[PDB]
Amino acid sequence: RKLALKTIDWVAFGEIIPRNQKAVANSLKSWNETLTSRLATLPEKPPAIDWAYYKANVAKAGLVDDFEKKFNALKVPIPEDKYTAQVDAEEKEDVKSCAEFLTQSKTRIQEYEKELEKMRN
Amino acid sequence: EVKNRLDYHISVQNMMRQKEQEHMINWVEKRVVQSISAQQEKETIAKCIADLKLLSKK
């Protein structure tokens, strides 16, 4: 498993953030840099066990059979969420970055650009 | 984490078999040997192969 599917560019996230979090982005960038590099290394999982070999060749062949029906049944989970509240914070921070600031910016850039049509006089 | 658990057993059965082998072997050899010469025929099998040297290396 590689980087989580969503990829935003490393300079477009990494220059710009709300004023409330301004210094925390440049740290969180480096924290996500070490995590994305640290996770990109790993073969996700080992091989299986050759069982008929292990049962023949460990001459304690009945200790072996416990560990078959145990290991063949005993399956590992992937770790869970605890911080996808960053996606709700991202929808709220897009309502802020887009809609709230976008429409407010479109009336303020127009406040100047309508004064630039007045400056044509 | 599983593997270590099987491998003791193997590795012990390997070491054990050698330690039975050497101890069997040593005790075994150290008991029986002597009666061999009272077969003079262990020097007759020397003479036998030796007469099949003595004809049959010439």
From Swiss-Prot, chain A:
Gene this protein is translated from: ATP5PD
GO MF annotations, alphabetized: proton-transporting ATP synthase activity, rotational mechanism
Record-given protein name: ATP synthase peripheral stalk subunit d, mitochondrial
N6-succinyllysine PTM positions: 75, 82, 92
Record-level GO cellular component terms: mitochondrial inner membrane; mitochondrion; proton-transporting ATP synthase complex
Functional note: Subunit d, of the mitochondrial membrane ATP synthase complex (F(1)F(0) ATP synthase or Complex V) that produces ATP from ADP in the presence of a proton gradient across the membrane which is generated by electron transport complexes of the respiratory chain. ATP synthase complex consist of a soluble F(1) head domain - the catalytic core - and a membrane F(1) domain - the membrane proton channel. These two domains are linked by a central stalk rotating inside the F(1) region and a stationary peripheral stalk.
Whole sequence portion shown: 4 to 124 of 161
Protein's UniProt keywords contain Ribonucleoprotein: no
Keywords: Acetylation, CF(0), Hydrogen ion transport, Ion transport, Membrane, Mitochondrion, Mitochondrion inner membrane, Transport
From Swiss-Prot, chain B:
Compartments reported by the entry: Mitochondrion; Mitochondrion inner membrane
Cystine crosslinks: none
Superkingdom of the source species: Eukaryota
Positions bearing N6-acetyllysine: 30, 42, 53
Family under the similarity heading: Belongs to the eukaryotic ATPase B chain family.
Subunit details: Component of the ATP synthase complex composed at least of ATP5F1A/subunit alpha, ATP5F1B/subunit beta, ATP5MC1/subunit c (homooctomer), MT-ATP6/subunit a, MT-ATP8/subunit 8, ATP5ME/subunit e, ATP5MF/subunit f, ATP5MG/subunit g, ATP5MK/subunit k, ATP5MJ/subunit j, ATP5F1C/subunit gamma, ATP5F1D/subunit delta, ATP5F1E/subunit epsilon, ATP5PF/subunit F6, ATP5PB/subunit b, ATP5PD/subunit d, ATP5PO/subunit OSCP.
Task of the protein: Subunit b, of the mitochondrial membrane ATP synthase complex (F(1)F(0) ATP synthase or Complex V) that produces ATP from ADP in the presence of a proton gradient across the membrane which is generated by electron transport complexes of the respiratory chain. ATP synthase complex consist of a soluble F(1) head domain - the catalytic core - and a membrane F(1) domain - the membrane proton channel. These two domains are linked by a central stalk rotating inside the F(1) region and a stationary peripheral stalk.
Protein name: ATP synthase peripheral stalk subunit b, mitochondrial
Gene: ATP5PB
